[PDB]
Design a binder for this molecule. Structure first.
Ligand SMILES: *[C@H](O)[C@H](C[C@@H]1CCNC1=O)NC(=O)[C@H](CC(C)C)NC(=O)OC1CC2(CCN(C#N)CC2)C1
Lengths: 293, 292
């Protein structure tokens, strides 16, 4: 199994740079709106900072071509700059707010120019482990379903521990973070249980099934046990997204939970699963199906 | 640290679907030529004979919801070249390159001429690649980007019984001793790309991971004796030179990192992990580590 990003071309066609004074970050140009982190305008009072701004103070560029700003507004932590040109490369798109544990592709950009693409999992504490250098703010995270781009992340900051935090495309942070340059702590991270379960299903699909036990369990039982091992509690949505893999294998989700509970309490007893002594938690049920099928 | 592919947009604009008979795979449309694996034309295939028997009209080439008219065809090594009557307006600046083993490249995996995923691969010393390629992936390409120029280095042809993959450059020459016939083929013994493992250990130190460092040291030759024993590639002096920037940046001499790797090979990691991995990783070049 490989971490595999979506092809980035449809998002590349939407990347621009936004500059206030000397401060440049990336923006997302969809139809006639450019979306970018509000801290391009800088414990700040963003509303009073924004009131002082006029359209003509914002430099928006696609490459070296200026896009004239004709309106500006703030939605939570994102600035929306209305521009006078509809992006001819606008894909079919939606804005979605993902759940922790879900994965997405990031197009890392600097000065509006893409540098690389890679897959991220959002940790249960709402941080991501990116590759985000200075000037990466406004880089976006996305999934692609058919020809529809689902934008789910916009990058804003790095935490003291080196992980990253940002918002959805409506400007609402993932996690208990603010776009102030203050010291901020993420919750203690946990292992993404639903993704480990997906991984075990993937092992079964490939014929590696020694760890399957003859018992089952309750979701509450598992969640109480799993908390002792630094595993995220399962939600009903988690059970639901395992449905296709459960159907593919005939193994009930709660039967797989019992198998995982046994692995956690007893360990691997010297064995490997998919050729690894470590359980993997960065592949979602969707990722497993994409790469097997 | 993180495996990072090049942005794939310039390659996406070149992918088309090619069908002959009941066989469908991907092609690369640059200017007015579509490049694809010649096994689209079909256990011992005489491709020259099968090719003489094909008509231009036998080849169904689609760029999305548009058929492209094949006005000509030829074969260079294991690559079929279909001349079409329309030039691809999205053709980027490009070159065809043959990569060296241990170098890396991005793969745009495609099915039915539609891009599905992008990821980073290395050309293994035994000239296989560890890809994620399913039925219908043939003709997917590998590439690097330098400035705005796309350097195409790989086109996908086959899977080996061990689950690794083999293909050609865009001139149609296989990497490795493989043949485009439907036989189970084994690769040579693979070996580990030492200079990349060292680059990755330096990446681990930059990210604050340093439990594996030691005060021990070693000569280049004594390192290489132990490396070869564990089926690692010998480290050349040019590879030492290539590691210079990461050495400067960390203040850890290349041969000091070699001494740490020797200890890792001899003992193991004893449950410990490096950058999250129970295994020593060898598909990051020095350049890949520096650029990031
Ligand atoms: C072209 O799309 C296809 C891609 C292969 C098919 C599935 N994954 C791939 O990479 N290439 C071929 O079908 C190729 C044509 C000949 C070289 C003319 N033949 C091929 O790759 O055969 C493979 C199947 C194989 C046996 C089953 N194994 C297991 N488990 C792995 C490899 C030999």
């Amino acid at each position: 199994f490989r971490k595999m990003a979506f092809p980035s071309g449809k998002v590349e066609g939407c990347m621009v740079q936004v500059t206030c004074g000397t401060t440049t970050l990336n923006g997302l140009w969809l139809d006639d709106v450019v979306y970018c982190p509000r801290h391009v305008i800088c414990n700040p009072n963003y509303e009073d900072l924004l009131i002082r701004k006029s359209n003509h103070n914002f430099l928006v560029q696609a490459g070296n071509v200026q896009l004239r700003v004709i309106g500006h507004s703030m939605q939570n932590c994102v600035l929306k700059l209305k521009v006078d040109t509809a992006n001819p490369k606008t894909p079919k798109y939606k804005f979605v707010r993902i759940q922790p544990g879900q994965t997405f592709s990031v197009l890392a950009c600097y000065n509006g120019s893409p540098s690389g693409v890679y897959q991220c999992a959002m940790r249960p504490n709402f941080t991501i482990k990116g590759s985000f250098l200075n000037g990466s703010c406004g880089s976006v995270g996305f999934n692609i379903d058919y020809d529809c781009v689902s934008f789910c992340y916009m990058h804003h900051m790095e935490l003291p521990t080196g992980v990253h935090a940002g918002t959805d495309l409506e400007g609402n942070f993932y996690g208990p973070f603010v776009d102030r340059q203050t010291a901020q702590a993420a919750g203690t991270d946990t292992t993404i249980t639903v993704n480990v379960l997906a991984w075990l299903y993937a092992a079964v699909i490939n014929g590696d099934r020694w760890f399957l036990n003859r018992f089952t369990t309750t979701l509450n039982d598992f969640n109480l046990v799993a908390m002792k091992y630094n595993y995220e509690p399962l939600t009903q949505d988690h059970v639901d997204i395992l449905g296709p893999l459960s159907a593919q294998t005939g193994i009930a989700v709660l039967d797989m939970c019992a198998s995982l509970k046994e692995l956690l309490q007893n360990g691997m007893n010297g064995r490997t699963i998919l050729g690894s002594a470590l359980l993997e938690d960065e592949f979602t049920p969707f990722d497993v199906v994409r790469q097997c099928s």
